[PDB]
Design a protein around this ligand. Structure first.
Ligand SMILES: O=c1[nH]c(N2CCC3(CC2)CN(CCO)c2cc(F)cc(F)c23)nc2c1CCCC2
Ligand SMILES: [Zn+2]
Lengths: 162, 46
C-alpha cells in the first residue's frame, strides 16, 4: 500500500522540511540524556509517504472534525518519533497503541520541537540508545522521524509545569 | 483514551521553560497522516 518517494536535496520541498527539522531543535532539561547532545542534524534522506487508503481515512476524518469546529480542521505539521516508525508508515497511526505514560492522557503524541520527538526514536527516554552501540547520543547510527499532518480540531489547552 | 468532552485533541503547552514548544495529543489514529519520513544523524557539537 505505502510507497516512499525520495525528495532531491535540490528540491524546495526537501529544503523546507529540513528547515523545520533544524529550526525546532532546542536544549532539553535532561542535558541530552534521552536524545543525545547536539545542536543540529545531518539530514540523510527525506521521503514522501504515499498511501491512498491512509490518506482517504485521514481526509475523511479531517472533514468530520472541521464540521464540528466552526469549519476549522486546525491542521498542523508536527513531529513524531517512535521505534515503530516502519509500522506507522505502512499501517497508519493506531489509537489502540496510545502512549499510556504521557502527561496528557493515553493518546498519540506529537511535538513542535523536532528534538523532543528525537527523544523517542530509540524508545521511551531514548531506551538503551542505538541498537548497534547502545548509545543514546550516537553520532553514527541513522535515526528516523516522521513529519506528520495532524488534525487538532477544537483543542483543549492544558498548561504544563515543564 | 478519549479527548476531553467537546474537544478533538489536547494541546500541552509548557508554562515554565519559555523556549519549549507545545506537544499535542490526539485520540484517533485517523487524525494524523505520516507525510514525511526523515532519515538523519544528530551532529556532534563543534
Ligand atoms: O514524538 C513523540 N513520540 C512519542 N512516543 C512514540 C513512541 C512510544 C512512546 C510515545 C509509543 N509507544 C506505544 C505504542 O507504540 C511506545 C512503545 C515503546 F516500546 C517505545 C516507545 F517509544 C513508544 N511520544 C512523544 C513524542 C513527542 C511529544 C512528547 C511525547
Ligand atoms: Zn550507534
Amino acid at each position: 500500500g505505502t510507497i516512499l518517494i525520495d525528495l532531491s536535496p535540490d528540491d524546495k520541498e526537501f529544503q523546507s522540511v529540513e528547515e523545520e527539522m533544524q529550526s525546532t531543535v532546542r536544549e532539553h532539561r535532561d542535558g541530552g540524556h534521552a536524545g543525545g547532545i547536539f545542536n543540529r542534524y545531518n539530514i540523510l534522506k527525506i521521503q514522501k509517504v504515499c498511501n491512498k487508503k491512509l490518506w482517504e481515512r485521514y481526509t475523511h476524518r479531517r472533514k468530520e472534525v472541521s464540521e464540528e469546529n466552526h469549519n476549522h480542521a486546525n491542521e498542523r505539521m508536527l513531529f513524531h518519533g517512535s521505534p515503530f516508525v516502519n509500522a506507522i508508515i505502512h499501517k497508519g497511526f493506531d489509537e489502540r497503541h496510545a502512549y499510556i505514560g504521557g502527561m496528557f492522557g493515553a493518546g498519540i503524541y506529537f511535538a513542535e520541537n523536532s528534538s523532543k520527538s528525537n527523544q523517542y526514536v530509540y524508545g521511551i527516554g531514548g531506551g538503551t540508545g542505538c541498537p548497534v552501540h547502545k548509545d543514546r547520543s550516537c553520532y553514527i547510527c541513522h535515526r528516523q522521524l516522521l513529519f506528520c499532518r495532524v488534525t487538532l480540531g477544537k483543542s483543549f489547552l492544558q498548561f504544563s509545569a515543564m | 483514551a478519549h479527548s476531553p468532552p467537546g474537544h478533538h485533541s489536547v494541546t500541552g503547552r509548557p508554562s515554565v521553560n519559555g523556549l519549549a514548544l507545545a506537544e499535542y495529543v490526539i485520540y484517533r489514529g485517523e487524525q494524523a497522516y505520516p507525510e514525511y519520513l526523515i532519515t538523519y544523524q544528530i551532529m556532534r557539537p563543534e
